[PDB]
């Protein structure tokens, strides 16, 4: 028989990572314009609107 003994050691490591990203944008512009003018003159009646 041999007299040696036992000496041991161990180590374990772990790591995890995660990232999430979400972005959105919406922009709508609406513009409407009109111009209407009428003219009437006779001689006697005058019409305008």
């Amino acid at each position: 028989a041999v007299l040696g003994g036992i000496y041991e050691y161990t180590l374990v490591m772990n790591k995890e990572a995660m990232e999430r990203g979400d972005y959105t944008l919406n922009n709508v512009h609406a513009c409407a314009k009109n111009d209407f003018k009428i003219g009437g003159a006779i001689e006697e009646v005058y019409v305008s609107l």
Partner: protein
């Protein structure tokens, strides 16, 4: 660790006006018409979670 965020804003604007002028002459006459309108809308919403 978790993070949640949401911030939204809404804006709306509208305006219109009508003007009418009618007058017969020949006995001069005058008629005036004025119309005005304006509309504004604003919305704000913000959410945050951790």
């Amino acid at each position: 660790a978790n993070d949640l965020l949401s911030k939204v804003k809404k804006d709306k604007s509208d305006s219109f006006g009508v003007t009418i002028g009618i007058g017969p002459a020949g006995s001069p006459l005058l008629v005036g018409v004025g119309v005005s309108h304006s509309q504004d809308t604003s919305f704000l919403n913000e959410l945050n979670k951790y």
